[PDB]
Each structure stands twice: as structure tokens, then as C-alpha cells.
Amino acid sequence: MGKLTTHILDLTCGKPAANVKIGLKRLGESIMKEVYTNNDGRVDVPLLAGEELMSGEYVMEFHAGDYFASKNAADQPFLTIVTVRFQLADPDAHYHIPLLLSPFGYQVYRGS
Amino acid sequence: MGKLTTHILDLTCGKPAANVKIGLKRLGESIMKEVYTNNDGRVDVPLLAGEELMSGEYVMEFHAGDYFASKNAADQPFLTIVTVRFQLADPDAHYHIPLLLSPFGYQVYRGS
Amino acid sequence: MGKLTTHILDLTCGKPAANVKIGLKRLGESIMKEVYTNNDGRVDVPLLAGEELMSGEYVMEFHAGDYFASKNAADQPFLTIVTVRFQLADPDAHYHIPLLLSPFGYQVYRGS
Amino acid sequence: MGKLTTHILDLTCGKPAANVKIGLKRLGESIMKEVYTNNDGRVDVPLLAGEELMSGEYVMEFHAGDYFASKNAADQPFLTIVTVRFQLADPDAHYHIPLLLSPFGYQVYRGS
Ligand SMILES: O=c1[nH]c(=O)c2nn[nH]c2[nH]1
Ligand SMILES: O=c1[nH]c(=O)c2nn[nH]c2[nH]1
């Protein structure tokens, strides 16, 4: 009964990044899920839980380019799809990986 | 005559991350280069320059897992290969993308 | 009925920083509060709320040095007291300012 | 013959933060220096060197509020003066402490 959640903050305006598409995939495979953050910059249902959450490597494709585009970065943005690889060791643990995001930089961390 | 350089700092000990392997690839392709940072956590020759640097999307595969492993994170580390996608718009510009790295989090930015 | 909360994550081990002392003070004054984070790296009661929360500048003194010391950085640590100044404009708003912390670097942000 | 340098990057536009005032002071004292970053977001002469650099705690007052103000955050900005405390142990070592800055968050690290 593990769990994988996330969270996006736009450091340009201190608000949660809303309606950003997030791709989810197992390492070496194709997208398996596609979600859009709510107003809190989170997703209602965990990105992964129970059976689903299998120990291994995953990748999340945060669509930063489109998000900043709507809030305005340019025709060929520096950040298009912020990609995040990570390995989930224990299948019964909680993994909260937020994303602090800016047009030209970002923080990826295992928060609480 | 554009240029792509990078830099790795281990925020766990304030020192540059040395001898870390860095994979380089164009979006959707296979590795095209493989380098190992020196003692300053940089690479002698630009990761990309002149002809090579074509406008588009690239990906750098920082091998964080192995680096921390040598400095010690575990059998199934949270971070294995920190992956970084980005788009290089102008082919004649300088792009310096450093990496602030920690066992459980990291910063990716367009520095100077 | 505004609110000021915070949160500390130790990026060295992906866990919340527990029992870290946090000083709170208005700009130019002496400490007014002193708290110790719980196991979630948070404090049970808001650091500021209602009447208390007056528009202006505050400072939080995160005692990183002692925290890392207990988990081990040295005799004269790089980070001793991570100091964070910020201005609270609206008195009725919620301000969540977490702290991503490492022996040699840290992130300060207005999260959700 | 130690050295203290710094560097400011505006993560909102990937450029160095130019002409930002930086206050320098020893712990518990008044400003001792006041500098303004050049176009590279650095200062020509080290903020501290040789004799000057004495082992102990210092504080740098990055004037983020004014900088973003000129580039535009509001009347009562979240960040006014980003304050950074740190301890310099060895007097003969090089300490490079850059600042990744955004209207609502920032990274402080011991870079190379
Ligand atoms: O949902 C979250 N809550 C928090 O308090 C937090 N702190 N960092 N990341 C976080 N994510
Ligand atoms: O090579 C670099 N030099 C610097 O001064 C710097 N600051 N941030 N990233 C950087 N990379």
C-alpha cells in the first residue's frame, strides 16, 4: 500500500502551478498515465498506489513549457518538458516528490 | 559558435562532484557523448560547441547514484540517473546548466 | 485570520528535519518565539496567526548547525543558523515557507 | 590569503542579476561593505580576502526586492532583502556562495 504523490509550485509568483500536465512512465516504457494538476498544484488521486506501485525506476514528465506559455516562455522555451527520473525502493512507502519550478531552473526533492 | 557547459556541486559536502559520468543525447536518440567530470566538477571540453550545437532538445544523464555510492546511497538509491531535458534555442549562444546535487533532491538551472 | 507555517526537509536523507529549533522575530527586534519541529519537520501550532500576524518583515532562525551536528557538521560548521527574512503583505493570507536543507546549501520558498 | 566571492542568477530569465546591491557584515555588527554586482552578477573584487577574511560568521544582504522592482515585485514584496548567514572556518580557503534567485524562492549554496 505504497503511495507516490507530487506537487508543483511556480516560484515566479509563489502560487501552485495549476492545470499542468504530468506524464508518468516506468523506466524504458511509454506513458502509462497523464494527469493535470488541480488548483493546489496537486492531483486528486495519487499518481501511484497499492498494486500499481512496484519497486523500480519511474519518470515524470512535467510539462513546464506549456504552463509558462499560458501564463505569458517563448517560441523555443528553455524548459519544455521537465523530466524527472527516480527509483522507488520500498513498495509500501510514501513518496512525495514536489517540483519547485521557474522558467530557467527548478528543484526536485523528496519532501514530506 | 555556441557552447554548452555544465557543473556539478555536491551539496552534502560543499565540494565539486568529481568523476561523475555524464551522458549527452539529442531528444529521442541514443547517447552521443559520455564524459566524466574532473576535480572541479566540470569537463575540460564543452559538452557541445560550434557545428555540434544545433538548435533543439537535448538530455543529460548525470549518474548521481554511482557517485554517491562511491562516497558511501544504498542498494536501490532514490536517485540513480538524474535526467535533465532542455531546449537550446539559439545555436550561437552560451548555455551553462549546472547541477546542485543531493541524495534526495537537486537544483537544475541556467547559470552564468 | 492570516497564517504563517513552515516545514523543514533534510535533503541529505529525504526525511523531515526533526526537533530543529526555529527562532521567530519581527524585523529589527529580538526573538519573540522559539519552537522545535516535530517528527514531520513542522510545528503543531502556526508560527503566526490572527492578531499576531501583522503586515511587515519577519525573520526565522533555523538552527541547521545543531541539527546536522546531532546527526553526525564539524566544529565550525558552514551553516550555523540559516536566517530567512521575508515580508508578509496581507495579514489575512496563508504563508507557507518551507526550507529544503543541506550541509552546504538550501532552498527557501513560498510553497502551498 | 582566503577568499569570499558570490554570484547572483535570476531564475526568472536565466540571466545574471545585474546591479543588485549586496550588503556584507560580520555577525552582530553593522554593514562593513556595500557592493553592486556587475553584468555577470558578480563583483570585480572579492567580497573578502587576505587579512580581511577572519574566521567567523558573516551575513550578506542581497537586495532582491529592489532588483525585481526595477525589472517590473509589488508595493510590499515577499522578498525584500534576502539575508544569508554562514560561517567561514578556514581563513585561507576559497568560499564561493552563489544565489539562485526568484520572486518567491531562492537557493543558497557553496559552489565552486
Ligand atoms: O504536500 C506537501 N506539503 C508540505 O508541507 C511540503 N513541504 N515540502 N513539500 C511539501 N509537499
Ligand atoms: O561555472 C560557473 N560559475 C559560476 O560562477 C556559477 N554560478 N552559478 N553557476 C556557475 N557556474
Structure description:
The structure is a homotetramer of 112-residue chains. Chain A has one helix at 64-70; strands at residues 3-10, 15-16, 21-26, 31-36, 48-49, 56-62, 82-88, 94-102, 105-109. Chain A has one domain (2-112): Transthyretin/hydroxyisourate hydrolase domain (Immunoglobulin-like), CATH 2.60.40. The first copy, chain A, has 112 residues and is mainly β. In chain A, strand 1 and strand 2 (15-16) form a beta hairpin. In chain A, strands 1, 2, 5, 8 and 9 form a five-stranded mixed beta sheet that branches. The longest helix of chain A has 7 residues, at 64-70. Chain A starts with a strand and ends with a strand. Chains in contact: A-B, A-C, A-D, B-C, B-D, C-D.
CATH superfamily of chain A: Transthyretin/hydroxyisourate hydrolase domain
Overall structural domain count of chain A:
1
Give me the oligomer status.
homotetramer
CATH secondary-structure class of chain A: Mainly Beta
The number of E-state strands of chain A comes to 9
Name the structural class of chain A: mainly beta
CATH architecture of chain A: Sandwich
Shape of chain A: globular
Strand % of chain A is over 45%
Order of helices and strands of chain A: EEEEEEHEEE
> Which ligands are bound?
8-azaxanthine
User: How would a textbook summarize the main sheet of chain A?
Assistant: 5 strands, mixed
Computed over alpha carbons, the radius of gyration of chain A is: 14 Å
Most extensive interface, chain pair and sizes: A-B, 26 and 26 residues
CATH level-3 fold name of chain A: Immunoglobulin-like
Distance between the termini of chain A: 17 Å
Total number of helical segments of chain A? 1
- What level of helicity do the residues of chain A show? under 10%
GO molecular function (chains A, B, C, D): hydroxyisourate hydrolase activity; identical protein binding
Family (chains A, B, C, D): Belongs to the transthyretin family. 5-hydroxyisourate hydrolase subfamily.
Keywords (chains A, B, C, D): Hydrolase, Purine metabolism
Binding site for substrate (chains A, B, C, D): 7, 42, 109
